[PDB]
Amino acid sequence: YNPEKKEMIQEVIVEEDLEPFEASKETAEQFKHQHGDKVDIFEIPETGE
Amino acid sequence: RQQLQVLARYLKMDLDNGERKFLKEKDTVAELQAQLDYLNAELGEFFVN
Amino acid sequence: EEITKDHKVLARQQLQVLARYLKMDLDNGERKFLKEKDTVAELQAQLDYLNAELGEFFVNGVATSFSRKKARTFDSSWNWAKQSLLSLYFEIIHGVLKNVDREVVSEA
Amino acid sequence: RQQLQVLARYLKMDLDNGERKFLKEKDTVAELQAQLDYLNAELGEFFVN
Amino acid sequence: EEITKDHKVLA
């Protein structure tokens, strides 16, 4: 904890689709549950992620 | 790939739209097949046929 | 200008994609410029403090003026003696010095 | 590189503008540092500090 | 919208 550098988080609306990133099945499903139609989750048949 | 995504964004083309529809339809297939499997477990193969 | 704006945005995105592929930092010159501008500001703050401290007159007046190449030597007293003799001679004959005044004595 | 230059030219984007400003500012830094070095050579480190 | 149609077709 550095009071000179106090961590916060700013809510922003995504203005452009971000590059896809890998995630687990459960993690991706949680992301889909949160964002609804504002996220796309797709299985990778090569590794099942 | 990046150039293709840029062009798709400009064209307002949803590359994932067919995939999303396919997964929705696959879930529909799974639920209808669950219904048919239940009716087959209930009435039996001989009765249903 | 919606169509031209959309085309400009497409060209911008294509340029960013190419810069990313080329590993080219478009903002690098700008970042260096802002860092150097901060350096300019801090050096100017130092100079402004020294000017507030010593004053404009002092800071300007401490400006260097000496240089070896600029020194002028005068040693041709032989020639200047002959010239002064001719000047005094002609002044006497032309009557600029009718009498033996102290200027004539000093030139002698 | 040629494709990027073509796009930058079309966009009226000066890729060298930041670098040009940086060299101008670096020259300004050199000149201000020359003045400070002269004042330090003149008054001395002890006086200036 | 011929010019924007050409834009889209080229893209």
Mutant choice from E7, E8, E9, E10 vs C, greatest count of C C-beta within 10 A: E7
One-character DSSP codes across B2-49 = HHHHHHHHHHT--TTHHHHHHHHHHHHHHHHHHHHHHHHHHH-HHHH-
Q: Do chains C and E touch (3 or more CB pairs under 8 A)?
A: yes
The answer to whether residues D19 and C24 touch, using CB atoms and an 8 Å cutoff, is: no
A16 in B contact zone (CB under 8 Å): yes
2-31 of B, contacting C, C-beta below 8 A: 2-3, 6-7, 9-10
- Helices C28-54/D17-43 angle, 10° precision: 30
The answer to whether residues E8 and B9 touch, using CB atoms and an 8 Å cutoff, is: no
3-state helix, strand, coil in chain D (%, to 5): 85, 0, 15
D35 CB-near residues (< 8 Å, 6+ apart): C47
What technique was this entry resolved by? Answer: cryo-EM
- Residue C66, SS3 per DSSP: coil
Q: What whole-number distance in Å separates Cα of residue B11 and Cα of residue B32?
A: 36
Q: Do A40 and B16 touch (CB under 8 A)?
A: yes
Q: What whole-number distance in Å separates Cα of residue B45 and Cα of residue C2?
A: 63
**Resolution of the structure, angstroms:** 2.6
Chains in contact with E, counting 3 or more C-beta pairs less than 8 Å apart as contact: B, C
Of A20, E6, C79, D12, the residue nearest B16 (C-alpha): A20
- Residue A5, SS3 per DSSP: strand
B1 in C contact zone (CB under 8 Å): no
